[PDB]
Design a protein around this ligand. Structure first.
Ligand code: 1A9
Length: 125
């Protein structure tokens, strides 16, 4: 069973655009998206499709790059750190749901390294 995907809009929450957020979409996300190991992370985990009936029994704060992309496109975030936290939640979810050495974990590990490389330096405000 699948819960609703994470919100990509919220009228109670203030919107913002910054140079760093623009960069997170244009450069960081859109480059990671093209990586050979990006595909498991491009949409919310579908526990019915993927036959992971316990996915959402284990993962209580799901996150994926499809959601992050939409949030960035919608100016959902206040700042870059908020967006960066979503990427980190996505990676840690993978390490939590699986186990060390798994192919899926090797994929997340490679993506996380590339992610860190790209956010090491962000544009100035
Ligand atoms: O995301 C997908 C498919 C996305 C999509 C890709 C393009 C077209 C068809 C489906 N599969 C998938 C399978 C699987 N199960 S798997 O055995 O096929 C697998 C093992 C190593 C990589 S995927 C897991 C996960 C997963 C994402 S986060 C997490 O912790 N797990 C994802």
């Amino acid at each position: 069973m699948n819960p609703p995907p994470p919100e990509t809009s919220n009228p109670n929450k203030p919107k913002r655009q910054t140079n760093q957020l623009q960069y997170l979409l244009r450069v960081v996300l859109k480059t990671l998206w093209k990586h050979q190991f990006a595909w498991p992370f491009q949409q919310p985990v579908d526990a019915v499709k993927l036959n992971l009936p316990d996915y959402y029994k284990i993962i209580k704060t799901p996150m994926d790059m499809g959601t992050i992309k939409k949030r960035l496109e919608n100016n959902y975030y206040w700042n870059a750190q908020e967006c960066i936290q979503d990427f980190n939640t996505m990676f840690t979810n993978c390490y939590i749901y699986n186990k060390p050495g798994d192919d899926i974990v090797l994929m997340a590990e490679a993506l996380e390294k590339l992610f860190l490389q790209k956010i090491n330096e962000l544009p100035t405000e």
